[PDB]
C-alpha cells in the first residue's frame, strides 16, 4: 500500500530486499494485482498501449532527428555507394587521440549507421535534411497526441466500458479497413505523389503536390475505366535513380524483377502492390456485423464449423467466448502471427531487396536479417508462453467441453510424444550425418562423406523459374501454361532476377543447404516441443496433478516425489528460450555464411565446407573472426575497436549468465548470512543498517536473471561478430 | 549545428539524470 509495491500487500509486507525485485518484476502483471477488475484491467491496458505507441513514435523521431542533425544524408544521397551512412555523433570523454582519429569519418566523430534507415528514407522520397527534420517534428507531435489521448482515456469521463473493449466485430472491421486498408491506400498515394516523382528526378513536396499531378493523363483514365494508361511507359531499364535520364510516366506498372541500377524492387511495382493490397483490405473490412445490420458474427461463424462425423468433437462451440473473455489467448494468437510476419519480413527482404542500394550494403543486410529473425524467435517463444498462461489462468474446462481446445488437452500426451519423436529423429540423423562427414573428411577422404542433394527444394526453385538445375517444370519451362500466361506480364523481369546468380533471389542450394536446413528443422521442432509441452502440461501432470493451483510461475514442489525442479510451465518457457536462441543462432549462422560466400565471389568454400562442422568452425567462426578480434592490439587500434570490446563484453555477460544458470539459491543464502554477520559485527560500519534484510535471489528470480544474462550475451556476441566481420571483410 | 548541446547533454543524461533518478527512486521505494 504505502511501500514500493503499492499493488500487492503480500510483497509490501516483505521485510527483505526480495520485495523490490518482485515488485519490479510483477509491475506489469495487472491481472495479479490485489484491487483489480476486468474493466480496470482493460482500461489500464488501453492507457499502456497509448503510452507504448508514444514511445515507439518518440524512438523513430529520435532516429530521424539524429540522422538529419548529425548524419550525412545530404552527402549520402549524391553518392549512396561511394560514401557510408552516419548514425549519430560520438561524444565520449574517454576517447583518446587515437580513438578520436579512428572513429573520425571526415568532419566529426560519428557511427556508421547499420540499420538501413538511409536507404529506406531515400527510397520513400526524402532528399534533404530539412525533410528529415520536419518528419521528426511531425512524429514528435504524433507522440504528444498519443500521450494526450492515453491520459484522456484514463479519466473517469472518457473511460471505455468493458463492452466496448469486447466489440470484436467492429474492432476487426475498423482495423482491416482503416488501420490496414486506408493506411496502405495512403502509402500508395504517397508513393505515386512523392516516391516515384522523387526517383524520377521530379521532387514533389507539400508546396507543389496540389499543383503538379503524378500522371500526365491525370485522373481521367481512372474514372473512365482504362487503367492501362497508368502502366503505359515504365522506366527504360537504364534509368538512373534520382535523375530523369530514361524516365517514364507509369505510376502503377507490374514489372517483374529489380531495378538494374539499384537492384531493388521497382517503386512503380511497389505502388501498384500497395494499391491492390489496400483494395483487398478495404473489401475484407466489411465482413463482420456492425450497427448497420449487414455482416457476420464471429460467434455464429465459429459455432457453424463442426464436422458432422464428430472427429473434431463439438467443433468450435464455445471457442468464441473463451477467446473474447481471455486476453492471454488473444495475446498468444497475436504474438504467434506477429512472429511469423516478422520472420517472413526478413526472408522476403533479403531475397527481394525493396530499398534502393540496400543490396550493396552487406553489413546492413546481415544486421537487419539477424535483427528481425532474433525478434521473431523472441515473439514466437512469447506467444507460446502466453498460451500456457492462458491454459492455467484463463481456461475453464467446464465451459470448454468437447471443444477443439479441450480435445487438444485430451490427447496432449500423443502430441508431446510425436513431437519428441520428430525432434529425436531429426537430431540423431542430422548430427550423425554432420559428424560422419566430419570424421571422413578428417581422415583425408572427403569423397566418402554422405552428401544428400536437396532435390525437393531444387524442384520448388525450378517451379518458381530457376534454370540452373534443369528441371524444366512450370515457370522454368517456357511451354508451361503458367509461364505462357504470365509471359507478357511479370515473368520476363522475374525470370531475369531469379536467374541472375548474383542476387539473393532463390539462391543456389547444395548438400550443405540440405544438412543445415535439416538442422533448422531439428531446432524448430525441439523448441516447439518444449513450448507445446509447457503449454499442454501447464494445468497438470502425473507428477503434479494440481499444477494449475500453483499458478504459472513458481519455484518447485520440493524434493518430494523424487524431485520437482523446473516443474512449472514458466520453466518450460525458460528452457525453450535457450533452444530458441540456438535455433535462431543456427539460422542466422547459415544466412550469414551463405551470404558471405556469395558476396566474396567464392561459393565453393561454402559448398565444400558446410558439409562438416569443422568447416563451420574454421572457415566461418575462426576465419571471419580475424578482423573482429583485431580491433585493438598492442600495435594500435581500428574503427572496429568498439565491436571487439562489445564482443568481449558479450562473452563476459554470457558467462555471468552461466553463473546464475549453474549455482542455485542456498549457497548464496548462506554466503549472504555470513556477509550480514560481518557487516553487523565490524566497528565504524555498524551505524549503517540495511533497511531491507539482504537475501539471495529467488529460485525463479535466479532463472530469469541467468536467462537474461545468457540472452544478452548471445545477442551482443553475435551482433558484434556479424557487424565486425561484414565490415572488415568488405571495408 | 549546436556543437555545445551534445557536450552539455551527454554528461547530464549520463551523470546528472542517473544519480538524481536513483536518489528519487531510492527514496520512493524505501518510503
Amino acid at each position: 500500500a504505502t511501500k514500493f509495491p503499492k499493488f500487492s500487500q503480500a510483497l509490501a509486507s516483505d521485510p527483505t530486499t526480495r520485495r523490490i525485485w518482485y515488485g519490479i518484476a510483477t509491475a506489469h502483471d495487472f491481472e495479479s494485482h490485489d484491487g483489480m477488475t476486468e474493466e480496470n484491467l482493460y482500461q489500464k491496458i488501453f492507457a499502456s498501449h497509448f503510452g507504448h505507441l508514444a514511445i515507439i513514435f518518440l524512438w523513430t523521431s529520435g532516429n530521424l532527428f539524429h540522422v538529419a542533425w548529425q548524419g550525412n544524408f545530404e552527402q549520402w544521397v549524391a553518392n549512396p555507394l561511394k560514401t557510408k551512412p552516419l548514425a549519430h555523433a560520438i561524444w565520449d570523454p574517454h576517447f583518446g587521440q587515437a580513438a578520436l582519429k579512428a572513429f573520425t569519418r571526415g568532419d566529426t566523430v560519428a557511427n556508421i549507421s547499420y540499420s538501413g534507415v538511409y536507404h529506406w528514407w531515400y527510397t520513400i522520397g526524402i532528399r534533404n535534411n530539412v525533410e528529415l527534420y520536419t518528419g521528426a517534428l511531425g512524429l514528435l507531435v504524433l507522440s504528444a497526441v498519443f500521450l494526450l489521448a492515453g491520459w484522456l482515456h484514463i479519466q473517469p469521463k472518457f473511460k471505455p466500458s468493458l463492452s466496448w473493449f469486447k466489440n470484436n466485430e467492429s474492432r476487426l472491421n475498423h482495423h482491416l479497413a482503416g488501420l490496414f486498408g486506408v493506411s496502405s491506400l495512403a502509402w500508395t498515394g504517397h508513393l505515386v505523389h512523392v516516391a516515384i516523382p522523387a526517383s524520377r528526378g521530379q521532387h514533389v513536396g507539400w508546396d507543389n503536390f496540389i499543383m503538379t499531378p503524378p500522371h500526365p493523363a491525370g485522373l481521367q483514365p481512372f474514372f473512365t475505366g482504362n487503367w492501362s494508361v497508368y502502366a503505359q511507359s515504365p522506366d527504360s531499364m537504364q534509368h538512373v535513380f534520382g535523375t530523369s535520364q530514361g524516365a517514364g510516366t507509369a505510376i502503377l506498372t507490374f514489372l517483374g524483377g529489380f531495378h538494374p541500377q539499384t537492384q531493388s524492387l521497382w517503386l512503380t511495382d511497389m505502388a501498384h502492390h500497395h494499391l491492390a493490397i489496400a483494395v483487398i483490405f478495404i473489401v475484407a473490412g466489411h465482413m463482420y456485423r456492425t450497427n448497420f445490420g449487414i455482416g457476420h458474427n464471429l460467434k455464429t461463424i465459429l459455432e457453424a464449423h463442426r464436422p458432422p462425423s464428430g472427429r473434431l468433437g463439438k467443433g468450435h462451440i464455445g471457442i468464441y467466448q473463451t477467446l473474447t473473455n481471455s486476453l492471454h489467448f488473444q495475446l498468444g494468437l497475436a504474438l504467434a502471427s506477429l512472429s511469423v510476419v516478422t520472420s517472413l519480413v526478413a526472408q522476403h527482404m533479403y531475397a527481394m531487396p525493396p530499398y534502393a542500394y540496400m543490396a550493396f550494403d552487406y553489413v546492413t543486410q546481415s544486421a537487419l536479417y539477424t535483427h528481425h529473425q532474433y525478434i521473431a524467435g523472441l515473439l514466437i517463444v512469447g506467444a507460446f508462453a502466453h498460451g500456457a498462461i492462458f491454459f492455467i489462468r484463463d481456461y475453464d474446462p467446464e465451459q470448454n467441453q468437447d471443444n477443439v481446445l479441450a480435445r487438444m488437452l485430451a490427447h496432449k500426451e500423443a502430441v508431446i510424444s510425436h513431437l519428441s519423436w520428430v525432434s529425436l529423429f531429426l537430431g540423431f540423423h542430422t548430427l550423425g550425418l554432420y559428424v560422419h562427414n566430419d570424421v571422413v573428411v578428417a581422415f583425408g577422404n572427403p569423397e566418402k562423406q554422405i552428401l544428400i542433394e536437396p532435390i525437393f527444394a531444387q524442384w520448388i526453385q525450378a517451379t518458381s523459374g530457376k534454370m540452373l538445375y534443369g528441371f524444366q517444370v512450370l515457370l522454368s519451362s517456357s511451354t508451361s501454361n503458367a509461364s505462357v500466361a504470365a509471359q507478357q506480364l511479370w515473368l520476363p523481369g522475374w525470370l531475369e532476377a531469379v536467374n541472375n546468380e548474383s542476387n539473393s533471389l532463390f539462391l543456389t542450394i547444395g548438400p550443405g543447404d540440405f544438412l543445415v536446413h535439416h538442422a533448422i528443422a531439428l531446432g524448430l521442432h525441439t523448441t516447439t516441443l518444449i513450448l507445446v509441452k509447457g503449454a499442454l502440461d501447464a494445468r497438470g501432470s502425473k507428477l503434479m496433478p494440481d499444477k494449475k493451483d500453483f499458478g504459472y510461475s513458481f519455484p518447485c514442489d520440493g524434493p518430494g516425489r523424487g524431485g520437482t525442479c523446473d516443474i512449472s510451465a514458466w520453466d518450460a518457457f525458460y528452457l525453450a528460450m535457450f533452444w530458441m536462441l540456438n535455433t535462431i543462432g543456427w539460422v542466422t549462422f547459415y544466412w550469414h555464411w551463405k551470404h558471405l560466400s556469395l558476396w566474396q565471389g567464392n561459393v565453393a568454400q561454402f559448398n565444400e565446407s558446410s558439409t562438416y562442422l569443422m568447416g563451420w568452425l574454421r572457415d566461418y567462426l575462426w576465419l571471419n573472426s580475424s578482423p573482429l578480434i583485431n580491433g585493438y592490439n598492442p600495435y594500435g587500434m581500428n574503427s572496429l575497436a568498439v565491436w571487439s570490446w562489445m564482443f568481449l563484453f558479450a562473452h563476459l555477460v554470457w558467462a555471468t549468465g552461466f553463473m546464475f544458470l549453474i549455482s542455485w539459491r542456498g549457497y548464496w543464502q548462506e554466503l549472504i548470512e555470513t556477509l550480514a554477520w560481518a557487516h553487523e559485527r565490524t566497528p565504524l560500519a555498524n551505524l549503517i543498517r540495511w533497511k531491507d534484510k539482504p537475501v539471495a535471489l529467488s529460485i525463479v528470480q535466479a532463472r530469469l536473471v541467468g536467462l537474461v544474462h545468457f540472452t544478452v550475451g548471445y545477442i551482443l556476441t553475435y551482433a558484434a561478430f556479424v557487424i565486425a566481420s561484414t565490415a572488415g571483410k568488405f571495408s | 549545428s549546436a556543437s555545445y548541446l551534445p557536450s552539455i547533454l551527454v554528461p547530464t543524461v549520463g551523470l546528472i539524470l542517473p544519480f538524481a533518478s536513483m536518489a528519487i527512486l531510492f527514496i520512493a521505494i524505501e518510503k
Binding site: 489500464k44 492507457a47 503510452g51 500521450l147 491520459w151 | -
Partner: peptide
Amino acid sequence: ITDNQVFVALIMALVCGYLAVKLAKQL
C-alpha cells in the same frame, strides 16, 4: 539543421516529456 531548429525540437521534446510524465502519474 540550424541551432534555432534544434532548440525548437528540444522545446517540443520537453512538452512531450511533460505529457508523458502526466500520463504516467495519472496511471
